[PDB]
Amino acid sequence: HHHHHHENLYFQSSAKQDFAEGVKLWQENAVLWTRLVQAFQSGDQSTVDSLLKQLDANAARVEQLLQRIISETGDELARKGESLFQRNQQLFSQLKTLFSQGDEDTAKAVLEEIQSNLNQIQQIITEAQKRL
User: Fold this and answer.
1) d(Cα 79, Cα 51) in Å, to the nearest integer?
2) Which residue segments constitute the domains of the chain, with CATH numbers given?
3) d(Cα 46, Cα 66) in Å, to the nearest integer?
4) Rounded CA separation 69/57 (Å)
5) SS3 for the chain, per residue?
C-alpha cells in the first residue's frame, strides 16, 4: 500500500487494507442485492430472505472493518459509511418482517431506501479512496 498524498494525512496501510476488504464485500452485496430485486420481482421471497441473510452478514463484516479503520486512523468517512451499513442492517430485518407479513408494497419502498444507501456508500468509498 502507498500513502503519498500531498496533504498531511495519517491514513494507515492496515486501515487501507480493511477498507479494500470492505469495498469488495460491498461489491458482493451490490450483486446479491441486484439478484434480490430480481427475485423480488418474480415474487421469490425465499431467495430474497436467503440473500438478506448474506447481505446482513457482509454488512456486519464491513461495519467491523470500518470500526477498525476508525480505531487506527479515525476516518470520518468510514464512520459515515458505517452508519449507512448499520441502517441497511435494520432495513434487512424490516424486510424480513414485511415479507413475513406479505407486505411487498412497503418492502419495495424499503429496498429503494437501501438502494439510495448503497449509492451513498459508493460515494463514501470514492471519497475515502481520494483521501487514502
Assistant:
1) 25
2) 13-131 (1.20.120)
3) 30
4) 19
5) CCCCCCCCCCCCHHHHHHHHHHHHHHHHHHHHHHHHHHHHHHCCHHHHHHHHHHHHHHHHHHHHHHHHHHHHCCCHHHHHHHHHHHHHHHHHHHHHHHHHHCCHHHHHHHHHHHHHHHHHHHHHHHHHHHHC
The residues near 14 (Cβ < 8 Å, ≥ 6 apart) are 68, 72
Structure determination method: NMR
CB 40 within 8 A of CB 111: yes
- Going by C-alpha positions, the residue among 96, 93, 112, 27 that lies closest to residue 61 is 27
Task: Please state, in angstroms and rounded to a whole number, the distance separating the CA atoms of residues 51 and 45.
Answer: 10
Cell numbers found for residue 120:
451513498
